[model samples]
Structure formats: structure tokens, C-alpha cells
Target: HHWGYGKHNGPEHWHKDFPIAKGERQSPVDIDTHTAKYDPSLKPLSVSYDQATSLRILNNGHAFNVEFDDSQDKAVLKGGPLDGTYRLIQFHFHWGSLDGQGSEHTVDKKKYAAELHLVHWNTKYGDFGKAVQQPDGLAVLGIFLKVGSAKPGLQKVVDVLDSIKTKGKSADFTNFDPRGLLPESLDYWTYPGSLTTPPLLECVTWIVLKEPISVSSEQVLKFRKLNFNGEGEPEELMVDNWRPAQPLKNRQIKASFK
Candidate 1:
């Protein structure tokens, strides 16, 4: 009911209600490898996922997210710039209306077809809602999506899109291991940034992967089938739901690889 990628309520105008939208350390920054510092001390990312913790998938108007049961430490993320364990809350995607325009983060100024974000909240903060407001309270693992071959695992998610074509629609999605969606390399870029969406909290420790996973052009298009409106409402396609990269300010992006 508040904001969207529409001409009126898009990213350009988000600052009207959320002043921090223009704050320093905002997310989706362009990662220039030539200028990025390589840190050998950066720990390898450790991901522990429980398929039973995956709850359901829902269309939240902006993007479709696969929510997880974060009531306990069943699914956790550690290492790679994190000092403690973080609980997996949900995973979502961002894409464009056309090819090569959807990703929020870019590499050497080259944008990908889409991006994936695995959102986790620090267990030290006790809960996600409380952690989101604290520094180092959240960690988001970012993976770029390029158009090429079909990803078998992603196809499982695609098959369920029809059921949740409209906003607020959800269906039980169980026993799905999200770790299968990751790429071969754990090498990534690390920095401090905010949520790409509203409130723009500057609490996230960004861990962007170096290797991009493959998805066919047809598979990428299927994501656009999700609607922003709920059932019996005016249908509006959810496309170009990604925010442009913000300034890096005085921040440094450290790479895990040489």
C-alpha cells in the first residue's frame, strides 16, 4: 500500500517518506574489482540449512520470498565477516522487466539479469525484528543470476509461481534445501550496506558471491508472472523491482579471492 517500482512510487521518490534512503552506506553498490581490496583473512562462508525449516512461499507485492522457520537455530549462517551465528529468516529475489537490468548490485558496472538475497538475522539479537535495527545485526548473502542454462533447483520454485500469482497469496513450500541454489565458489565481496527496500536500515553485512549461477532466459521471464495486486484486484506485473546502486561513500569492499 506504500511503495513499489511504479513511475510514481518508485526508488527515485522513496526519500519522501524515508529520509535515510539517501544516507551513507546504502546498498546495491557497484563493485569495482580493480579497486576492491583482497583480504586473505576473510573466513570461508559456512551455510547450514535444514529443509524442514522451510515454511512457505509468498508473493509480498514487491518480491516473492521463501520464508523459513527461524524460531530456533535450526538453519544458520556463519563465517565470512560474521563474528557469530545468524539464523536464516527468508530468501528472495530481485529482477528487471528486461534482460541485463534487474540486479541491485553490479560488478565492474555490469548488471546481471537478476539477484538472490538470503536474509539472516543475528542470533545474538534474539529475533529478526530486533536485530534489523542494530549494527551487525543482519547478514545478507547475495548471488547474481545470469541467463543461460536452466537451473533444475530453481525450476522447483518456478513451478509454484502459478499458485501465488497475486500479492498476499501463499502456499505451503516444504523440505526445500536452499543451499542447492548456491554456486560452486564461496569467494565473495564483503561490505556494510543497508536494505535495498524501504526504511533502508544500514544494519546488513553484505556478502556478495563472485560466481553467478545460471538460469535460462525463459526461466527468468517466469518470475515476471507474479502480480503486485491481490486476487479480484487490478493486475499489475511485478517487474524491475530492483533499486539502483547507491554511492559507496567512504566504505571499502573486501574480496575473499585474489
Candidate 2:
């Protein structure tokens, strides 16, 4: 089973949620940090794929992780909102064991049914592991998911969810470009924060996209069986697996919308 010391353990106590789920500041629950001052001039991430790179599908709970190649050529995001060129590293998803109302982060005090994070690194600064160690080195693009709409972009991934329906199973994906799944709007909110899980290094510059992508009602249902806290057990149906929001730590939350 995917075991990790979650909220019951302590936000700073996750060295065991595997590699991706073990970040210092793991997410699912998001804290609100309104800075009163906003910047209307900033643009969001207009992620462009130069070429097709390698991809991997890991059977992580809740959904299949589609990790794209973060090499310099096929995995780069062009100029839009960031000052430096960010390289694609790893991308993952977060959802409730059953329902769609239990994500960890909330936008404008609103919570999505689920979330997908497309993690990228500012290669101009350093590689992923190195960038993840610095507060300003990593950039994570957060996309909210809800139950509705025909998610054609997600169809490529949904087709493979059944193959790795269980935990600890993974597959190699090639020739498929993930940039197609990126949301149309390049607008987002940026901030300096730490990893949501463990190793919770205050090294992440979070770029939460203002707009969200749809995942279809059926797709959300199929994904529930992949996580731990699904709606089959006794104790609250494993309804949500999100971490509570952390303090702003006097940090500023900036967005392109201002």
C-alpha cells in the first residue's frame, strides 16, 4: 500500500510518501494567502512543446502519473510568465479516494474536485533535484480538475488507466507528447513556497494556473478506484487525502490576473 505519514503524522514528517509524495510541503489542502497587492501585467505559462519526448506511466494512487521527458529540447516551456526557462521534470495528480470535493488547495476560497501538477524546473538555475532544494529553483503548474466536459486531452491517459489499475505497477510511455494536455490559458498565480510534502524545502515557486481543465464525470469515477481513501471503507469512505493548508510564512502570492 502507499503508506506515508499524512496529516495524522505531521506536515513536516513525511520522508516516506515515496519520492513524489514525500516533498516537505505536500499538497491536497491549500492555504489562503491574499497579498492585497496584485500584478495585472504578468502573463501565465504558454507552455510550448518543441518535439515529442519520452514519457512514463507510474501507477500512483488515484491516477496514472504521466511523466514527460524534461530534456532541454522537447521539454521546455517558452516565455510567457516566468523570467527563466523552465524544464519539464515530473507531473502527477491528486484526488479524493471517492468524491471530487476534497483537494488540498483552494482557489479564491473555492476547491476543485481534484488537481494535477505539472512540475517543472528552472534549468537556467539548476536540475530538478538541485532546483527542488532551492526555494526559487522549482516551478509547479497546478491545474484544477472537475467532473464535466469531454476531456479529449486526457483521453490519451484515460485509455491506459485500466492497465495499471493496481498499485506498484508502472509502464513506459514513448512517442506521446504531454503538452497536448496543457490548459489553453497561460495565466497563473505565482508564489514562493516550499514542497507540499516532505523534504519540504522552501524552494518551490508555485505557479497555480487561474484556469482549470475538465476531466469528465466518468473519468473522475474511474480514477477513484486507484487511490487509498476511496468510498468503499467504513471510516468516512476515504473521502479525501489532502493535507491542510500551511501558514503563508509572510510570503506573497502573485498572479497574472492581479
Candidate 3:
């Protein structure tokens, strides 16, 4: 059966298919900021994204993500907790039905209005398919989104939602730079984690920023307007498409900043 945020096939039921949901290093762990230790070895990561590399925006029934041209390393992430360079593949978001809470990863048990994941695939693995099975396959950069003043970066993204209201739709979206969506501080907490959603691959290194970018609740409503089902099927709002934090287990979270 297909997976979704329904009563049966939701995040809770993913384990039935992808048994690794209970894996020791599963992602979106509760970032007990108090417990995360500062690691001097960690360095500031580089976010080099070429504005021309943005290809299009898509509604994959799971979430809306802006796809980038990863054929070349026009956009790459290096340093920090990662060893080799990772190419920016796509970026997406996860939010709640309400503005009060939605983020998969919590800081000190505090939830943000939403969360953003900039997904990248390591180049050494040759391609994404093979990379997903490796231990250091993916690197997801997470940024929390709080309810506040309107964010121009986020507004640019929401402006195109009306065109792709239904699932499985896409439109050309070029010259979109994701760096505009980032918070002031790049300080983050790094850990060995997994993809927050289905397949729940345990091949990711999560770099969740401590600072959050601000966006209005109205813009988030635009995301809610998306249809979870295709045009011919019964419609449903695509809100609360986030997985809850999994167990931290014995993994130690390293802080990039104090």
C-alpha cells in the first residue's frame, strides 16, 4: 500500500514496511541543547549555491520541494561534520496543521511552526540510488521556521503554490536561491540521523541550525492549501506532513557553536 499521513499509513505505520524506523540512529531527535557537547573539531559549513542551478518546483504528494540541477557541483555543502562534498539535490519543508507546533526535531522540547530540509547527496558514492544505502550517503540541513514577520524568501516559494495545488504537479522555478531562506546564525547541532520520512534511511548526517527563520502563519496556510490526493481523487489538505522525533539512543549530538 502507498504511504501517507493517514490514520493507517502515516509515520507510525512506516515501520511495517521500512523496519528501520526503530533503528538506533533514526532522525529528528529531541535536541536536548543542554546535553549536546561543543565539538572544536567541527567547522563552519559552506553553502555555495549557484542561482542558475534551480530547476523546478514539485508537489510529490509528500511535500513541495524545489529541485536543483545536481549534475554538477554548482551547489554544494562541505566541512562541518561531513568529510567529502555533498551536492544539493532538493529542498523541502514540514509543518503542522497549526502554527503552534510542527517541527520534527525539537530543541529543549520546544517546537517551531515548521521545519526546512535542504537535502544533499554525497558525490563519492557516484549517484543518489547507491548513496542512500551507504552510511554517509545523505546530509540534510534542517532549519526551523517560527511564526513572525513575513519572509521574502519563503514568500517567493509560496507564491507558486496555487499553480501546483494538486499532488503530482510541477512548474518551472529557476533563479531561486535557497540561501535567502536561512537564519542569521548558521550555528547548528550535528548528529548521526536518518531521513525523517519514509524508507527512513539511516544514512544521513543531520545539521540542524539553532537559529530559526521567521515567516508568517498566513504563508504556511498556502502550504495547507495543497491537495494530498490527485485531481481526480477525493481531496485532502496536505498539512502536518512531518514525522515526530525518534529516540536519540546513545548517539552524542555535537554542537558547532556554544
Each prediction's TM-score versus the true structure: 0.97, 0.79, 0.97
Stretches of candidate 3 off by over 4 Å are: none
Regarding lDDT, does 1 or 2 come out ahead? Answer: 1
Which residue runs does candidate 1 get wrong by more than 4 Å? 50-52
Query: What local lDDT does model 3 show for residue 130?
Result: 87
Looking at model 1, the pairs that clash are: 96-102
Clashes of each: 1, 24, 0
Minimum summed lDDT over a 10-residue window in model 2 is located at: 229-238
Candidate number with the higher TM-score (1 or 2):
1
Q: RMSD of each candidate?
A: 1.1, 4.8, 1.0
lDDT-better candidate, 1 vs 3: 1
Q: On a 0 to 1 TM-score scale, where does candidate 3 land against the true structure?
A: 0.97
Give the candidate number with the greatest lDDT: 1
lDDT of 2 by residue, 1-258 (tens): 334425555444454544544434444334354642467666545575657475778764434567777756567664545677777776777666555464557875677887777777878665687776665677777887877786887776767766665555677777666766677786666666666555456666677766778778787766665534333433222235455565454556665754
lDDT of 1 by residue, 20-106 (tens): 999988998999999999998998889887533888999999999999999888888899899999999999999988887899999
